[PDB]
């Protein structure tokens, strides 16, 4: 006990950096599910987020599958197209937003507040994904971490779109 | 400052593995409290979850109390009966559920979404509980970690029971 | 990739203890935003929490700014006045509360449940803040960690104020 398996049945510590990486993707997936279930976004944002939840499972499958020279069967890996899709969504959803000069106090709607929670969890997942690469520079792909990086940018953008209180700004004083 | 006490007044780093373990049990307890307060489960599931919250405090008391040869007064420890009770709940609640072939996108009801959040926090708590044992193989009991392990199985089962959207499945594509 | 910048443009690992500290302040800020957006506290508690969200950004700016002998421009730092303000709020809000003899099961209202979630995240942020100091005893200030320490005391107090189920107590049995 205290051990479990990767996608290739390889035994691993429940403390393992790869497992912590795709476990945090799970936590991020749940956080996005909470934003959907309690924030009730419009149908278009709902479809975007549901697609991200699908992507996050693709990222966890990538992280749970060691990189090998020639595998038994082709592995599921994140690709740059995943990230370019997030970039496209960022541009579209950020186009109507006014310019931001300072930090925003997270909150507002249930949807915007929960998108902020998901943002911070996703960024925690990203930190874990980079720690997985640091531990296995040759065995772990960096695209999962790069996908999580841009996802937090998108979640921040969507949190602003969804906020009816507008941008409540941080006054350093 | 930066130090605190275990159950025996022993001084400990606020970074300590045992403290991180029972602190994550606290976070898991709060997550379950959110599922209750926002998901409004039926009275039967409410009683199950409230009992788990009670168990989690028993687990934290176990984790905060070093194992010693003969203690001043008898310690509160998790027992196999705690875990067998969770196993019994898993079987009962999983009996009516259809067979699952793939991963589920967390979400659906407020209750099912928040049970997914609690699931991922509990699994984070489990990882912390195993790290506590690794650091003190002789001083920390493994039953807290084993209880958290099966609790995440139950929370997954309950999340399916509570979901009115059924199982929204991950399409790897 | 896998690197980012502190407030002084210094390059840093996305695993860095200082970054993990002010990232957890962000997560705590979001958690408080969720309590506001879903718990709908009265106007007075709303103003207290919004002020704390402002303080947390001040703490993150402190943590992201290395301590130096004579800086280019004066840094934003947490002060004892921040903490004394939290102490004042604790006393006021705890005055009407009955004496507590045991642990409370987190939950109750949406507000009180989410204040418990925020409490546990803030305590996680505190642990991270102390780890930042341990890593840079001379470069990181301890007042951010001390502010987070007392904030968790206040959030516990407010969670009791907000709970309509009163104190649901842990029975170790
Ligand atoms: C990595 C991993 C995860 C990671 C990341 C997964 C991801 N993002 O892709 C995380 C931590 C998120 C995870 C979570 C869970 N997992 Co998991 N996981 C694994 C693992 C190791 C690899 C999965 C994978 O990525 N395969 C790669 C993809 C491409 O394979 P695939 O073509 O989709 O085929 C998979 C599915 O059909 C899946 N599957 C088949 N039947 C079932 C039934 C259920 C309920 C689930 C969830 C999956 C499942 O298993 C196949 C092989 O992986 C497998 C064991 C293994 N060695 O394969 C366990 C495994 C799939 N996990 C399992 C379980 C139980 C779960 C959890 C319910 C644990 C929990 N209580 O929280 C959750 C469910 C989360 C959710 N939303 O559905 C079980 C499912 C079997 C069962 N009926 O008990 C497995 C088989 C391990 C085990 N034997 O206990 N897991
Ligand atoms: C481990 C520990 C926890 C851990 C795990 C606890 C668990 N799962 O059992 C965690 C991190 C979850 C925790 C949380 C908190 N704790 Co604590 N904790 C401790 C500790 C170290 C041991 C508790 C224990 O498990 N005892 C074993 C069981 C079997 O003992 P028991 O028979 O139940 O007797 C206990 C209770 O009566 C309890 N108690 C007595 N009066 C009060 C009043 C309050 C408000 C609470 C919460 C408890 C409490 O203290 C007795 C001795 O432990 C004690 C200090 C110590 N050395 O005992 C502090 C202690 C109980 N904690 C304390 C506090 C303040 C809290 C928090 C409010 C901190 C916060 N701001 O979040 C939260 C409350 C969480 C909740 N839902 O109620 C205080 C309570 C005293 C007070 N009035 O200020 C103590 C005494 C430490 C201190 N002096 O500051 N804690
Ligand atoms: C530390 C830090 C944070 C930390 C802690 C911040 C804190 N608690 O104070 C955390 C992790 C919380 C954080 C979060 C984010 N940050 Co930040 N962060 C930094 C950083 C390194 C220092 C900020 C600071 O504390 N300055 C000290 C205070 C006193 O300075 P100030 O007088 O307030 O001046 C600042 C503001 O005007 C701010 N600013 C100016 N324009 C904009 C626009 C936006 C959208 C934001 C959020 C801030 C911002 O930048 C100035 C210089 O820091 C800067 C880069 C740098 N080297 O300065 C990036 C920076 C401010 N962050 C940035 C971003 C993108 C974000 C996030 C949106 C990331 C995300 N996707 O989650 C979130 C927003 C969180 C929120 N609620 O608003 C950007 C903003 C620029 C832009 N338009 O893209 C910067 C400039 C880095 C970058 N170039 O990518 N960050
Ligand atoms: C926006 C600012 O937040 C910090 N930063 C960058 N990436 C992350 C992450 N994944 N998690 C937390 N903080 C991060 C850096 O300091 C950056 O400059
Ligand atoms: C279900 C899959 O999730 C991983 N796994 C097992 N236990 C945990 C845990 N506590 N936290 C996160 N991931 C876990 C293993 O890879 C297992 O096979
Ligand atoms: C109240 C009890 O909780 C533990 N404790 C103290 N500070 C923290 C923290 N920031 N996070 C988690 N647990 C903590 C100590 O054991 C203390 O005695
Ligand atoms: Mg980034
Ligand atoms: Mg398990
Ligand atoms: Mg404290």
PDB file of C-alpha atoms in Angstrom, chain C residues 3-165:
ATOM      1  CA  UNK C   3      10.303  29.725 -15.497  1.00  0.00           C
ATOM      2  CA  UNK C   4       8.713  33.068 -14.678  1.00  0.00           C
ATOM      3  CA  UNK C   5       9.520  36.382 -12.999  1.00  0.00           C
ATOM      4  CA  UNK C   6       9.325  37.909  -9.549  1.00  0.00           C
ATOM      5  CA  UNK C   7       8.335  41.543  -9.006  1.00  0.00           C
ATOM      6  CA  UNK C   8      11.925  42.635  -9.791  1.00  0.00           C
ATOM      7  CA  UNK C   9      11.988  40.674 -13.094  1.00  0.00           C
ATOM      8  CA  UNK C  10      14.261  38.082 -11.442  1.00  0.00           C
ATOM      9  CA  UNK C  11      13.806  34.717 -13.151  1.00  0.00           C
ATOM     10  CA  UNK C  12      12.429  31.935 -10.977  1.00  0.00           C
ATOM     11  CA  UNK C  13      11.301  28.335 -11.198  1.00  0.00           C
ATOM     12  CA  UNK C  14       7.553  27.813 -11.402  1.00  0.00           C
ATOM     13  CA  UNK C  15       8.302  25.518  -8.435  1.00  0.00           C
ATOM     14  CA  UNK C  16       9.818  28.354  -6.402  1.00  0.00           C
ATOM     15  CA  UNK C  17       8.846  28.631  -2.741  1.00  0.00           C
ATOM     16  CA  UNK C  18       8.138  32.365  -2.956  1.00  0.00           C
ATOM     17  CA  UNK C  19       5.932  31.875  -6.023  1.00  0.00           C
ATOM     18  CA  UNK C  20       4.116  28.969  -4.368  1.00  0.00           C
ATOM     19  CA  UNK C  21       3.533  31.290  -1.407  1.00  0.00           C
ATOM     20  CA  UNK C  22       1.877  34.131  -3.314  1.00  0.00           C
ATOM     21  CA  UNK C  23       0.149  31.666  -5.642  1.00  0.00           C
ATOM     22  CA  UNK C  24      -1.533  30.161  -2.572  1.00  0.00           C
ATOM     23  CA  UNK C  25      -2.506  33.694  -1.526  1.00  0.00           C
ATOM     24  CA  UNK C  26      -4.218  33.909  -4.922  1.00  0.00           C
ATOM     25  CA  UNK C  27      -6.035  30.611  -4.311  1.00  0.00           C
ATOM     26  CA  UNK C  28      -7.090  31.909  -0.888  1.00  0.00           C
ATOM     27  CA  UNK C  29      -8.303  35.139  -2.501  1.00  0.00           C
ATOM     28  CA  UNK C  30     -10.429  33.137  -4.956  1.00  0.00           C
ATOM     29  CA  UNK C  31     -11.839  30.997  -2.139  1.00  0.00           C
ATOM     30  CA  UNK C  32     -12.936  34.158  -0.317  1.00  0.00           C
ATOM     31  CA  UNK C  33     -14.470  35.411  -3.562  1.00  0.00           C
ATOM     32  CA  UNK C  34     -16.513  32.214  -3.761  1.00  0.00           C
ATOM     33  CA  UNK C  35     -17.800  32.708  -0.209  1.00  0.00           C
ATOM     34  CA  UNK C  36     -18.924  36.213  -1.182  1.00  0.00           C
ATOM     35  CA  UNK C  37     -20.553  35.227  -4.476  1.00  0.00           C
ATOM     36  CA  UNK C  38     -22.359  32.107  -3.218  1.00  0.00           C
ATOM     37  CA  UNK C  39     -22.890  32.831   0.486  1.00  0.00           C
ATOM     38  CA  UNK C  40     -24.161  36.398   0.105  1.00  0.00           C
ATOM     39  CA  UNK C  41     -22.976  37.761   3.468  1.00  0.00           C
ATOM     40  CA  UNK C  42     -24.447  40.875   5.020  1.00  0.00           C
ATOM     41  CA  UNK C  43     -22.972  44.189   3.930  1.00  0.00           C
ATOM     42  CA  UNK C  44     -20.673  44.479   6.959  1.00  0.00           C
ATOM     43  CA  UNK C  45     -19.022  41.068   6.544  1.00  0.00           C
ATOM     44  CA  UNK C  46     -18.846  41.738   2.803  1.00  0.00           C
ATOM     45  CA  UNK C  47     -16.777  44.858   3.496  1.00  0.00           C
ATOM     46  CA  UNK C  48     -14.476  42.968   5.871  1.00  0.00           C
ATOM     47  CA  UNK C  49     -13.851  40.190   3.348  1.00  0.00           C
ATOM     48  CA  UNK C  50     -13.341  42.583   0.429  1.00  0.00           C
ATOM     49  CA  UNK C  51     -10.741  44.374   2.564  1.00  0.00           C
ATOM     50  CA  UNK C  52      -9.004  41.053   3.246  1.00  0.00           C
ATOM     51  CA  UNK C  53      -8.919  40.325  -0.484  1.00  0.00           C
ATOM     52  CA  UNK C  54      -7.169  43.681  -0.863  1.00  0.00           C
ATOM     53  CA  UNK C  55      -4.758  42.762   1.932  1.00  0.00           C
ATOM     54  CA  UNK C  56      -3.968  39.406   0.309  1.00  0.00           C
ATOM     55  CA  UNK C  57      -2.825  41.201  -2.845  1.00  0.00           C
ATOM     56  CA  UNK C  58      -0.603  43.345  -0.599  1.00  0.00           C
ATOM     57  CA  UNK C  59       0.812  40.149   0.914  1.00  0.00           C
ATOM     58  CA  UNK C  60       1.491  38.628  -2.499  1.00  0.00           C
ATOM     59  CA  UNK C  61       3.271  41.797  -3.595  1.00  0.00           C
ATOM     60  CA  UNK C  62       5.369  41.530  -0.428  1.00  0.00           C
ATOM     61  CA  UNK C  63       6.186  37.874  -1.116  1.00  0.00           C
ATOM     62  CA  UNK C  64       7.010  38.516  -4.788  1.00  0.00           C
ATOM     63  CA  UNK C  65       9.490  41.309  -3.898  1.00  0.00           C
ATOM     64  CA  UNK C  66      12.878  40.175  -2.538  1.00  0.00           C
ATOM     65  CA  UNK C  67      14.181  41.992   0.526  1.00  0.00           C
ATOM     66  CA  UNK C  68      17.135  44.209  -0.407  1.00  0.00           C
ATOM     67  CA  UNK C  69      19.395  46.646   1.412  1.00  0.00           C
ATOM     68  CA  UNK C  70      18.383  49.771  -0.422  1.00  0.00           C
ATOM     69  CA  UNK C  71      15.785  49.258  -3.166  1.00  0.00           C
ATOM     70  CA  UNK C  72      15.238  51.241  -6.311  1.00  0.00           C
ATOM     71  CA  UNK C  73      11.802  52.335  -5.096  1.00  0.00           C
ATOM     72  CA  UNK C  74      10.042  51.717  -1.775  1.00  0.00           C
ATOM     73  CA  UNK C  75       8.488  48.246  -1.598  1.00  0.00           C
ATOM     74  CA  UNK C  76       4.946  47.345  -0.619  1.00  0.00           C
ATOM     75  CA  UNK C  77       5.186  45.345   2.610  1.00  0.00           C
ATOM     76  CA  UNK C  78       2.709  43.968   5.114  1.00  0.00           C
ATOM     77  CA  UNK C  79       2.889  45.708   8.494  1.00  0.00           C
ATOM     78  CA  UNK C  80       1.844  44.847  12.036  1.00  0.00           C
ATOM     79  CA  UNK C  81      -1.096  47.234  11.575  1.00  0.00           C
ATOM     80  CA  UNK C  82      -2.584  44.789   9.064  1.00  0.00           C
ATOM     81  CA  UNK C  83      -2.459  42.047  11.701  1.00  0.00           C
ATOM     82  CA  UNK C  84      -3.721  44.233  14.546  1.00  0.00           C
ATOM     83  CA  UNK C  85      -6.707  45.017  12.317  1.00  0.00           C
ATOM     84  CA  UNK C  86      -7.443  41.297  11.986  1.00  0.00           C
ATOM     85  CA  UNK C  87      -7.097  40.850  15.754  1.00  0.00           C
ATOM     86  CA  UNK C  88      -9.602  43.655  16.269  1.00  0.00           C
ATOM     87  CA  UNK C  89     -12.037  41.950  13.913  1.00  0.00           C
ATOM     88  CA  UNK C  90     -11.596  38.601  15.683  1.00  0.00           C
ATOM     89  CA  UNK C  91     -12.438  40.054  19.109  1.00  0.00           C
ATOM     90  CA  UNK C  92     -15.502  41.913  17.834  1.00  0.00           C
ATOM     91  CA  UNK C  93     -16.966  38.968  15.913  1.00  0.00           C
ATOM     92  CA  UNK C  94     -16.120  36.397  18.609  1.00  0.00           C
ATOM     93  CA  UNK C  95     -17.733  38.407  21.426  1.00  0.00           C
ATOM     94  CA  UNK C  96     -21.253  37.100  20.855  1.00  0.00           C
ATOM     95  CA  UNK C  97     -20.236  33.515  20.196  1.00  0.00           C
ATOM     96  CA  UNK C  98     -20.729  30.853  22.888  1.00  0.00           C
ATOM     97  CA  UNK C  99     -17.715  29.036  24.273  1.00  0.00           C
ATOM     98  CA  UNK C 100     -16.513  26.151  22.099  1.00  0.00           C
ATOM     99  CA  UNK C 101     -15.301  22.916  23.692  1.00  0.00           C
ATOM    100  CA  UNK C 102     -14.675  20.682  20.660  1.00  0.00           C
ATOM    101  CA  UNK C 103     -14.207  20.667  16.901  1.00  0.00           C
ATOM    102  CA  UNK C 104     -17.016  21.710  14.563  1.00  0.00           C
ATOM    103  CA  UNK C 105     -18.087  19.809  11.474  1.00  0.00           C
ATOM    104  CA  UNK C 106     -17.717  22.361   8.642  1.00  0.00           C
ATOM    105  CA  UNK C 107     -20.899  23.095   6.745  1.00  0.00           C
ATOM    106  CA  UNK C 108     -24.236  24.708   7.523  1.00  0.00           C
ATOM    107  CA  UNK C 109     -25.089  27.680   5.330  1.00  0.00           C
ATOM    108  CA  UNK C 110     -23.441  28.138   1.940  1.00  0.00           C
ATOM    109  CA  UNK C 111     -21.629  31.087   3.518  1.00  0.00           C
ATOM    110  CA  UNK C 112     -20.361  29.198   6.569  1.00  0.00           C
ATOM    111  CA  UNK C 113     -19.373  26.153   4.508  1.00  0.00           C
ATOM    112  CA  UNK C 114     -17.424  28.278   2.035  1.00  0.00           C
ATOM    113  CA  UNK C 115     -15.790  30.223   4.868  1.00  0.00           C
ATOM    114  CA  UNK C 116     -14.516  26.864   6.119  1.00  0.00           C
ATOM    115  CA  UNK C 117     -13.110  26.096   2.663  1.00  0.00           C
ATOM    116  CA  UNK C 118     -11.419  29.502   2.635  1.00  0.00           C
ATOM    117  CA  UNK C 119     -10.093  28.873   6.151  1.00  0.00           C
ATOM    118  CA  UNK C 120      -8.351  25.651   5.111  1.00  0.00           C
ATOM    119  CA  UNK C 121      -6.945  27.219   1.943  1.00  0.00           C
ATOM    120  CA  UNK C 122      -5.641  30.197   3.940  1.00  0.00           C
ATOM    121  CA  UNK C 123      -3.934  27.796   6.348  1.00  0.00           C
ATOM    122  CA  UNK C 124      -2.403  26.016   3.358  1.00  0.00           C
ATOM    123  CA  UNK C 125      -1.214  29.420   2.132  1.00  0.00           C
ATOM    124  CA  UNK C 126       0.282  30.067   5.576  1.00  0.00           C
ATOM    125  CA  UNK C 127       2.279  26.828   5.454  1.00  0.00           C
ATOM    126  CA  UNK C 128       3.571  27.896   2.042  1.00  0.00           C
ATOM    127  CA  UNK C 129       4.466  31.349   3.387  1.00  0.00           C
ATOM    128  CA  UNK C 130       6.574  29.824   6.166  1.00  0.00           C
ATOM    129  CA  UNK C 131       8.278  27.535   3.648  1.00  0.00           C
ATOM    130  CA  UNK C 132       9.191  30.651   1.657  1.00  0.00           C
ATOM    131  CA  UNK C 133      10.841  32.174   4.729  1.00  0.00           C
ATOM    132  CA  UNK C 134      12.682  28.942   5.545  1.00  0.00           C
ATOM    133  CA  UNK C 135      14.125  29.002   2.021  1.00  0.00           C
ATOM    134  CA  UNK C 136      15.106  32.705   2.185  1.00  0.00           C
ATOM    135  CA  UNK C 137      15.338  33.657   5.872  1.00  0.00           C
ATOM    136  CA  UNK C 138      16.871  37.020   4.936  1.00  0.00           C
ATOM    137  CA  UNK C 139      15.001  37.677   1.689  1.00  0.00           C
ATOM    138  CA  UNK C 140      11.387  36.972   2.659  1.00  0.00           C
ATOM    139  CA  UNK C 141       9.371  38.741   5.349  1.00  0.00           C
ATOM    140  CA  UNK C 142       7.475  36.761   7.981  1.00  0.00           C
ATOM    141  CA  UNK C 143       4.559  39.193   8.340  1.00  0.00           C
ATOM    142  CA  UNK C 144       2.695  37.714   5.333  1.00  0.00           C
ATOM    143  CA  UNK C 145       2.721  34.345   7.104  1.00  0.00           C
ATOM    144  CA  UNK C 146       1.673  35.962  10.384  1.00  0.00           C
ATOM    145  CA  UNK C 147      -1.168  37.773   8.604  1.00  0.00           C
ATOM    146  CA  UNK C 148      -2.385  34.509   7.073  1.00  0.00           C
ATOM    147  CA  UNK C 149      -2.128  32.860  10.490  1.00  0.00           C
ATOM    148  CA  UNK C 150      -4.569  35.296  12.093  1.00  0.00           C
ATOM    149  CA  UNK C 151      -6.798  35.386   9.000  1.00  0.00           C
ATOM    150  CA  UNK C 152      -7.605  31.699   9.506  1.00  0.00           C
ATOM    151  CA  UNK C 153      -8.623  32.513  13.086  1.00  0.00           C
ATOM    152  CA  UNK C 154     -10.967  35.213  11.772  1.00  0.00           C
ATOM    153  CA  UNK C 155     -12.416  32.993   9.038  1.00  0.00           C
ATOM    154  CA  UNK C 156     -13.176  30.327  11.647  1.00  0.00           C
ATOM    155  CA  UNK C 157     -14.911  32.954  13.800  1.00  0.00           C
ATOM    156  CA  UNK C 158     -16.924  34.274  10.857  1.00  0.00           C
ATOM    157  CA  UNK C 159     -17.874  30.727   9.841  1.00  0.00           C
ATOM    158  CA  UNK C 160     -19.472  30.292  13.269  1.00  0.00           C
ATOM    159  CA  UNK C 161     -21.242  33.659  13.089  1.00  0.00           C
ATOM    160  CA  UNK C 162     -22.639  32.689   9.680  1.00  0.00           C
ATOM    161  CA  UNK C 163     -23.752  29.158  10.600  1.00  0.00           C
ATOM    162  CA  UNK C 164     -27.506  28.783  11.279  1.00  0.00           C
ATOM    163  CA  UNK C 165     -27.048  25.163  12.424  1.00  0.00           C
TER     164      UNK C 165
END
